[PDB]
Design a protein around this ligand. Structure first.
Ligand SMILES: CN1C(=O)C2(CCN(c3cnc(C#N)c(Cl)c3)CC2)c2cc(Br)ccc21
Lengths: 53, 1380, 98, 57, 55
């Protein structure tokens, strides 16, 4: 109740930092991790049906 | 190899062609100062060189260089031609006598049908009406003789040229005497016109001459129709059309439009196009109230004056440095053109007469002045600014657009599948939305907030629909042209217009492409593909082989038509097909319904839509696409991609086109290529060539933008707090807006409606500008109380048509291939039915049809381009045979009879008599026999109120005896009844072009390099043999069940392609790269035409009626039993069930006074006025919808199957329903289910709908049975009458009792309604009641038969195996697992 | 603990306020017409003054300024106005018609 | 009161998520397809994974 | 309960940071970054085939 809200606050601070960095810059591994994770979770849905045969 | 040229304009008039020809001939910039004139004078084409080297052209050029003649522009000579009145000779008598003869013959032909109708209703000329009309039409007026003479002259010139060019290739017509004053040098590649006493000369093209002839024909048709209608309305006010034009004003209108076209220039069409708005203003001044109509009037004036100022500016700019610099009139510089314009507009108002009928019919004026020359590079440059512009959006706008789209999709899934779509992102939803998700519900628009859409825009989906794995050959194959690859684009231009390095490059680089890549048409693009595979499109889409492809171009041809190579066109077609198949079910506002009654349906359902203020907004979405970008289209294309499990299939356009060069590939408009440059993406950007196109090509991706517009309308309705009812039909958006308001003190309903309209318009403008679409005051208007949609006008529930606009091009050889006689007759008849279906005039339509049928048969057969006069000799021998058989007195009477008997028996009447009362019928042979009986009553004096009697006049007995007596000669009974359940057999009916060209098409296809076509065409004949052998032992023949069996096999799809290919000219030269016709095709067509003309000699033999001393007795004769016997005897079959149906026009006797008999249907008039045309009543509009089957649908997941599989399942279910009595039904169904669907019968039976209807003879849904039975009157009028069919079920249950009978009650009601209409037309007073009493001699039982016999399983397997390349996708194990 | 919920709410409000003033410029051709440019995101005033300095090439910049600012230009104000005003040629033609 | 104050942070985070996802989707345009990085920004869908599975087993 | 309402917030925050990482990585002008992305995706595909073929 006391630590969790502070984790939320730190993540919001980092969010504001990256959002400034994005919106003022008019002129990779985390992204690949997320891509791989969700591609694996879609392949799992495919495998469930492939094994249900 | 013969060359047949056009007789009507089918194409565009080219600016660049005329520019190049005139620039080479006169040695200077003719129309513009383009690159076209420079390359034309540098390196002219060989046809231009041929035209310039003639002996008369050299003389005229010498005269021009000496300053003795002045050069002009084609609009000047159009104005000169349309006022040609040097018709003062012994030429003035011949034209008048010819027109008088045509009119007299048309009335004499119409007399027979008028007599028959007046006899049936109980109401050389035998009718008093037509005798008065003939007395009234004895002197044609001068304005009609003018246009008839002009059309005759121009048509003679064209016929002479076409005949002499068929006989000799490379023929130039040099004419000086046909049209006194003018000198024509006509050809296929140009036209030179010279006027000697005015000292004028012009150069134009062949299509411009065709346009001039079409103009003269259109004005002749207008004058004919208005003269006939005026003469009809002078005898009886209900007899003619609803319009009342005066032809002096119409002549003045033609003159002033020609003056506007001659005064400004080619640029003058832009002005006349604006006058449509002017007419709309004159309509609103009648229907709308002060504020709306004042707003529209001021906006219209502004639009017209802006158009005129822009026209003057562009005209003065274009002709500055050309050879036409001294052709600009002085009335343009000093501004005195306005006076002219004013007079024009005044005449239009004087022509309107302050009447909605005149003002609605007056829209023919915009098809009277011709067509402009379309400048191509300029049309390309006009949109380059709109599609290269940068757009700025707020992120909230895109979020809310995506959220509204996702809301529409969620709501559609919940309504259609009782299930939220599968989300992969439900973490992002809040609690109140998670409740909706897990309860499988959604909130309404009144409970929806703008934050909810931003929350919804974050959802991601799983695959819900599946892509087909094998290509459908019916959707990718058509009869159009295709774009070359990017390296072979320079083959779009003549070799003379290309530099030497480009020619060398083309010849050295055509050696590295396939034979299908070097193709210039779609059909041969597919036929020449020797590496074709049906899983090519699926692999292209899944692998994204269309992204970053170096073979991609966009080629424009003007109104612009764009094309690309074949792969990208495949991807485009597939994307639009998937949208039409899977998504348009969630957007019921998107329509594609263009039709006679469908538009009336839409306008009716639109009219059905402390105060409730209302308004309507009309918007034009033609230029809607140029404003779209990736950011605005693909936020929804992404949702569709996720729903189909693919990537960038619906986003292909804005990801591929920005990297392509857009080029104009007109033949006469090449670009300037700098030397040492061969690649197209390296050529300098110029007029007619550019890059970096953002925005989308017109026509491609239209459905995406339609559903996005609908989502934006939902967003606007949310933001504005009012109710919206929207309709989009193509490129026309209509919005009805409603809002509850509390009226102030003294405020009127009108002011509240106006305030609502203004605020809604502000909100619409702002919400459209938020996504980068800037609406103009020329594309949008507001109103309150007039229903307008797709150029169709309704007011107070009454519909106002524009028939004259659609009957403008009726003529000799319209809409045919190789000048077919039968198709031309059919098209004339079908085009003239519109003066009766919409115009509500039987007799005007009839007389116009007879005028042009007589002209086409008795005057234009002698002048056939390929069949010089053989068809006329055939006609004369048929007339002699008819005169001998029926004991007539002349060949004139013989032709009057020939023109009145149906085309089924070999006659020349394209319109059967039942179509004046109802539109559909279930049996053509009975209608043909009844029509023949009614027509022959004219000569035999039989009365159509008594019964069939034997009299001393035995013409009808002779006719019926020759109909039922002939020599049986059947051949291929079952496959023929499969492809047409109404066929006769034993050569008892006329043949059509498909049956004639089938074998030629298959032998041409047997040699195609594509194996999918070669094997099919090589197995065609044995497949036909097997298909005839399949269902031959099932003895009770049901041709509709045979049709159902036929449609469930791959030979159906194989035959679609052949029927499509057999509709081209020169079928033999498909793979020969030639535009000429082979003599074999001409011989085939000629012999077909001759056989079809002389059919009436074989059907009605003089041979003692085929040695039949027995004559037919008519005492107690049933026409429907005779029809059934005739149909069975021609196929040598014992019993054929479910095809014969009585005729309502023959079965029903018509009474007007009520009697104690108390029988038949009753039709009463609920209106209180004596007349009904142009009124509305308190009843519901009659739509004769038929009763389909009652069936229960099994419960499974349907979106797991495609559409072909869901269609095959319904077909197999109908087969299980119908042929459930045969002796080996289990093996039959097992074979079908395992051959076509891939599953066994036990597993497939779980997806079959179960039919609760017992009598399939009565309720079966096949493509060969009519689905609805409307009347021959407009819908708005059906509301004036009330019907009851109860007194007939009391007599039909004592004679049969609880049994099904063969009769359509829908057609009975339609007959009654059209009968009311026609009696009002002919008597000038509508009757109060009519009673229809049936003849029970014609009604029979309809009980489902018990089938006996065995189906041949071996032949079924042979048919399935020989055409295996057209089978649909099998249902997999992975798919059948998810089905449950 | 509300003293921390307040600092969470202020941060959420700041993020939602800086996300409701973002402006997106569509992708298009570069300067001197060679290549395509990416889509650009940036705060409202920065984008407006980038339009003024014509660093982003476009026509009709006045309505762009007046629409990125929640304001109504006079062109669009008469497009949706109560009454329509004629032109000199329009009044000439209207006098000729009456 | 803590739950009623936590049921608003969620509705603000959901709006932030919607806006940021719309931005992610609108930023993967023709230049991303030209450079070949668009599938790293939109995700791999059923058809590619099925092709990978068919070429794996 | 409160622990679930905090778990939801944690999940949403992680999703937001993921979206922001995507947006900021994809917005790199030099060609090096966009070449690294496609090389990493090349790798990922034929490393996913490994885990698929294993089981
Ligand atoms: C400003 N504005 C107009 O003046 C009109 C209305 C009248 N209209 C026609 C044209 N042809 C026919 C025919 N047949 C008919 Cl029946 C009406 C032309 C354009 C119009 C239509 C649409 Br959608 C959108 C805006 C406008």
């Amino acid at each position: 109740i006391t630590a969790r809200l502070d984790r939320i606050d730190e993540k919001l601070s980092e969010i504001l930092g990256m959002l400034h960095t994005l919106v003022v810059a008019s002129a990779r591994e985390e992204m690949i991790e997320k891509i791989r994770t969700e591609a694996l979770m879609t392949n799992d849905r495919l495998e469930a049906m492939a094994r249900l045969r | 190899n013969v060359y047949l040229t056009d007789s009507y304009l089918k194409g565009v008039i080219s600016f660049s062609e005329c520019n190049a020809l005139g620039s080479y001939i006169f040695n200077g910039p003719y129309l513009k100062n383009d690159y076209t004139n420079l390359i034309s004078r540098q390196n002219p084409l060989i046809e231009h060189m041929n035209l310039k080297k003639l002996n008369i052209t050299q003389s005229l050029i010498s005269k021009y260089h000496k300053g003795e003649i002045k050069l002009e522009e084609p609009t000047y000579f159009q104005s000169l031609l349309m006022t040609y009145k040097s018709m003062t000779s012994s030429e003035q008598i011949a034209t008048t006598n010819l027109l008088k003869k045509i009119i007299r013959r048309a009335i004499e032909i119409s007399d027979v049908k008028v007599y028959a109708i007046l006899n049936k209703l109980g109401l050389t000329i035998k009718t008093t009406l037509l005798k008065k009309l003939m007395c009234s039409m004895q002197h044609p007026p001068s304005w009609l003789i003018h246009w008839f003479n002009l059309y005759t002259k121009l048509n003679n010139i064209l016929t002479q040229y076409r005949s002499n060019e068929v006989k000799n290739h490379g023929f130039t017509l040099i004419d000086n005497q046909t049209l006194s004053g003018f000198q024509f040098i006509l050809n296929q590649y140009g036209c030179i016109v010279y006027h000697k006493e005015l000292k004028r000369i012009t150069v134009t093209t062949y299509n411009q001459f065709l346009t001039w002839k079409d103009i003269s024909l259109s004005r002749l048709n207008v004058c004919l129709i208005t003269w006939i209608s005026n003469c009809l309305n002078t005898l009886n006010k209900s007899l003619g059309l609803r319009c009342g034009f005066n032809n002096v004003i119409l002549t003045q209108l033609f003159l002033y439009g020609d003056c506007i076209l001659k005064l400004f220039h080619n640029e003058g069409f832009y002005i006349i196009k604006e006058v449509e708005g002017f007419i709309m203003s004159l309509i609103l001044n009648i229907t709308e109230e002060d504020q709306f109509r004042k707003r529209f009037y001021n906006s219209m004036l502004n639009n017209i004056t802006d158009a005129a100022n822009k026209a003057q500016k562009n005209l003065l700019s274009r002709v500055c440095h050309t050879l036409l610099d001294k052709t600009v009139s002085d009335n343009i510089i000093n501004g005195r053109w306005i006076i002219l314009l004013s007079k024009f507009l005044k005449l239009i108002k004087l022509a309107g007469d302050n009447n909605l009928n005149n003002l609605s019919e007056l829209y023919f004026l915009f098809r009277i002045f011709g067509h402009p020359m379309v400048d191509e590079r300029q049309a390309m440059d006009a949109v380059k600014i709109n599609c290269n512009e940068t757009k700025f959006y707020l992120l909230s706008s895109l979020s809310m657009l995506r959220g509204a789209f996702i809301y529409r999709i969620i709501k559609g899934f919940v309504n259609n599948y009782n299930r939220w779509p599968t989300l992969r992102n439900a973490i992002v939803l809040p609690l109140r939305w998670l409740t909706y998700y897990k309860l499988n519900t959604y909130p309404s628009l009144l409970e929806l907030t703008e934050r909810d859409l931003i929350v919804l825009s974050g959802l991601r989906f799983y695959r819900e629909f599946r892509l087909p794995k094998k290509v459908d050959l019916e959707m990718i194959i058509n009869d159009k042209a295709i774009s070359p690859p990017k390296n072979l684009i320079w083959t779009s231009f003549p070799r003379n217009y290309m530099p030497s390095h480009i020619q060398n490059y083309i010849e050295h680089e055509k050696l590295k492409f396939s034979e299908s890549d070097k193709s210039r048409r779609v059909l041969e693009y597919y036929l020449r593909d020797n590496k074709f595979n049906e899983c090519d499109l699926y692999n292209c889409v899944v692998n994204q082989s269309y992204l970053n492809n170096p073979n991609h171009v966009v080629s424009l041809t003007g109104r612009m038509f764009a094309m690309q190579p074949g792969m990208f066109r495949q991807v485009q077609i597939l994307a639009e097909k998937m949208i039409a198949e899977n998504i348009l079910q969630f957007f019921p506002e998107s329509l594609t319904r263009y039709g006679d009654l469908e538009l009336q349906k839409i306008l009716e359902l639109k009219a059905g839509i402390n105060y409730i203020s209302k308004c309507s907004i009309i918007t034009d979405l033609s230029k809607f696409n140029q404003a779209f970008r990736y950011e605005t289209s693909c936020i929804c294309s992404d949702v569709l991609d996720e729903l189909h499990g693919v990537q960038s299939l619906f986003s292909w356009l804005h990801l591929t086109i920005p990297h392509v060069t857009i080029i104009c590939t007109y033949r006469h408009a090449p670009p300037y290529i700098g030397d040492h440059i061969v690649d197209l993406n390296n050529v300098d950007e110029q007029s007619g060539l550019y890059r970096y196109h953002m925005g989308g090509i017109e026509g491609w991706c239209q459905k995406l933008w339609t559903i996005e517009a609908i989502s934006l309308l939902d967003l606007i309705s949310l933001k504005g707090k009012f109710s919206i009812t929207a309709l989009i039909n193509g490129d026309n958006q209509s919005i009805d807006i409603s809002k509850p308001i509390r009226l102030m003190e003294g405020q009127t309903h009108a002011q509240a409606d106006y305030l609502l309209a203004l605020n809604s318009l502000k909100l619409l403008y702002k919400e459209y500008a938020g996504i980068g679409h800037k609406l103009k005051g020329t594309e949008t208007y507001i109103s309150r109380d007039m229903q307008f949609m797709s150029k169709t006008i309704q007011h107070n529930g009454v519909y106002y048509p524009a028939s004259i606009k659609k009957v403008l091009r009726v003529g000799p050889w319209i809409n045919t291939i190789l000048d077919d006689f039968k198709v031309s007759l059919e098209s004339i008849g079908s085009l003239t039915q519109e003066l009766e279906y919409r115009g509500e005039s039987l007799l005007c339509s009839l007389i116009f049809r007879n005028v042009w049928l007589y002209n086409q048969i008795a005057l234009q057969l002698k002048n056939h381009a390929l069949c010089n006069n053989k068809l006329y000799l055939d006609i004369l021998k048929v007339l002699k045979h008819l005169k001998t058989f029926f004991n007539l007195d002349n060949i004139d009477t013989a032709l009057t009879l020939y023109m009145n008997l149906p085309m089924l028996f070999g006659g020349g009447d394209p319109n059967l008599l039942y179509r004046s009362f109802y539109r559909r019928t279930p049996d053509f042979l009975t209608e043909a026999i009844v029509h023949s009986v009614f027509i022959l009553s004219y000569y035999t004096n039989h009365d159509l109120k008594d019964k069939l009697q034997d009299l001393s006049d035995d013409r009808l007995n002779k006719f019926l005896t020759c109909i039922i007596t002939f020599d049986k000669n059947p051949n291929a009974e079952f496959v023929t009844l499969m492809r047409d359940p109404q066929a006769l057999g034993s050569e008892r009916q006329a043949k059509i072009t498909s049956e004639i060209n089938r074998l030629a098409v298959t032998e041409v296809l047997s040699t195609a390099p594509n194996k999918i076509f070669s094997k099919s065409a090589q197995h065609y004949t044995t497949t036909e043999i097997d298909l005839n052998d399949i269902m031959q032992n099932i003895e009770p023949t049901y041709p509709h069940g045979l049709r159902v069996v036929y449609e469930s096999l791959p030979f159906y799809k194989a035959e679609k392609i052949v029927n499509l290919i057999s509709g081209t000219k020169s079928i033999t030269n498909i793979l020969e790269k030639t535009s000429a016709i082979d003599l074999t095709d001409i011989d085939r067509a000629t012999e077909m035409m001759r056989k079809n003309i002389t059919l009436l000699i074989r059907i009605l033999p003089l041979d003692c009626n085929r040695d039949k001393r027995e004559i037919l007795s008519m005492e107690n004769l049933s026409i429907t039993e005779l029809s059934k016997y005739v149909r069975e005897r021609s196929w040598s079959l014992s019993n054929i069930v479910g095809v014969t149906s009585p005729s309502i026009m023959y079965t029903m006797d018509i009474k007007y006074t009520t009697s104690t008999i108390s029988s038949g249907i009753i039709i009463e008039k609920y209106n209180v006025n004596s007349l009904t045309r142009g009124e509305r009543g308190p009843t519901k509009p009659w739509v004769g919808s038929s009763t389909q089957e009652k069936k229960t649908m099994p419960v499974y997941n349907r979106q797991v199957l495609t559409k072909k599989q869901r269609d095959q399942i319904d077909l197999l279910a109908k087969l299980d329903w119908v042929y459930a009595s045969i002796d080996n039904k289990d093996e039959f169904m097992e074979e079908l289910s395992i051959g076509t669907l891939g599953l066994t019968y036990e597993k497939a039976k779980k997806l079959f709908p179960q039919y609760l209807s017992v009598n399939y003879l009565h309720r079966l849904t096949v493509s060969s049975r009519p689905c609805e039975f409307p009347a021959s009157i407009p819908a708005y009028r059906t509301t004036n009458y009330h019907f009851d069919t109860s007194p007939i079920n009391r007599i039909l249950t004592e004679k049969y009792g609880d049994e099904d009978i063969d009769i359509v009650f829908q057609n009975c009601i339609s007959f009654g309604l059209s009968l009311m209409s026609v009696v009002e037309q002919f008597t000038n007073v509508c009757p109060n009641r009519i009673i229809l009493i049936p003849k029970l001699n014609e009604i029979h039982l309809m009980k489902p038969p018990i089938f006996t016999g065995d189906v041949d399983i071996h032949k079924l397997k042979q048919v399935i195996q020989k055409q295996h390349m057209f089978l649909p996708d099998k249902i997999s194990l992975t798919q059948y697992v998810e089905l449950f």
